[PDB]
């Protein structure tokens, strides 16, 4: 399934496979119902709004999205 199709629950299952230090952000992603399409389109400002104020943490999430995006489109 393309990531652009993922439901909010599928985004949360993906996040659960990421670094231990990002697990704290899962409640916010869940509350806001971030879909797969929204995740592929995610920005630094959207992460800040989702409670990710540490720039190190923003960059780990963005690194992981960039990797997911490359896989999605088979780059």
């Amino acid at each position: 399934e393309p990531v652009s199709k993922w439901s909010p629950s599928q985004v949360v299952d993906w996040m659960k496979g990421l670094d231990d230090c990002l697990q704290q952000y899962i409640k916010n992603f869940e509350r806001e119902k971030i879909s797969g399409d929204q995740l592929l389109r995610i920005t630094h400002q959207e992460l800040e709004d989702l409670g990710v104020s540490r720039i190190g943490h923003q960059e780990l999430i963005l690194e992981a999205v960039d990797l997911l995006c490359a896989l999605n489109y088979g780059l």
């Binding site: 230090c21 540490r54 720039i55 190190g56 943490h57 780990l60 963005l62 690194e63």
Partner: protein
């Protein structure tokens, strides 16, 4: 010489003290923002600004160190990869 992708925030602050030592007042921003090696490879001039390095000259000096470390990293990794071949 541990590769930057493997650097902990501790390794980042050691890096900072060595190369950005004259700008010791921003050292704790890197701790507060949890800048690991992996983050250090991604941040931009804009991130530094958002983190609190508002002074342009101080920011350019730090940014120049970051770019220098990234080049060093890239070169040494190429050299390492060539030794393993392939």
């Amino acid at each position: 010489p541990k590769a930057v992708y493997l650097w902990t925030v501790s390794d980042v602050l050691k890096w900072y003290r060595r190369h950005c030592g004259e700008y010791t007042q921003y050292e704790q921003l890197f701790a507060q923002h949890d800048i690991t090696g992996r983050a250090l490879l991604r941040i931009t001039d804009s991130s530094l600004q958002r983190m609190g390095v508002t002074d342009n000259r101080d920011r350019e000096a730090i940014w120049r160190e970051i770019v220098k470390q990234r080049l060093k990293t890239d070169i040494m990794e190429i050299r390492d990869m060539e030794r393993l071949n392939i």
